[PDB]
Amino acid sequence: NKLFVSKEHAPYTDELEEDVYLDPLARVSKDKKSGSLTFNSKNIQSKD
């Protein structure tokens, strides 16, 4: 009875929300610790 999994948090933190909004190429990655898909500062506004 857990088909609906409410997200407790957005994929970006409050401090990184603006950066994610302003970067069109920002994409989520799997966090090694939490294991969930989240935005990473290293991946935001990166030449890669």
């Binding site: 603006e18 302003l22 069109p24 190429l25």
Partner: protein
């Protein structure tokens, strides 16, 4: 011909990630970020909405490389007409025109 004009005159920035939608819309007509001289704010006269909207416009202006000392002049129309629950953006559009 219209496809070429769309590609080079209207939608030249849809594909480019280095051009924002706002900057591209301005530059379609030769304007720049600094040419966006007026901002019809929602201006609901509430704490959260006004602070959030001012922050949003400020962040747009920062990221789009607006010249320092060139603030957008904010127009708050709901001080006079109040806040309708959906005619608001239409009244602000009329005022902007």
């Amino acid at each position: 011909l219209r496809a070429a004009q769309q590609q080079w005159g209207n939608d030249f920035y849809k594909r480019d990630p280095r051009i924002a939608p706002l900057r591209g819309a301005l530059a379609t007509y030769g304007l720049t970020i600094d040419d966006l001289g007026v901002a019809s704010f929602h201006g609901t006269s509430t704490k959260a909405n006004d602070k959030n909207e001012s922050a949003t416009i400020n962040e747009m202006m920062k990221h789009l490389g607006r010249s320092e000392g060139n603030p957008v002049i904010g127009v708050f129309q709901k001080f006079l007409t109040g806040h309708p629950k959906g005619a608001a953006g239409a009244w602000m559009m009329n005022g902007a025109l």
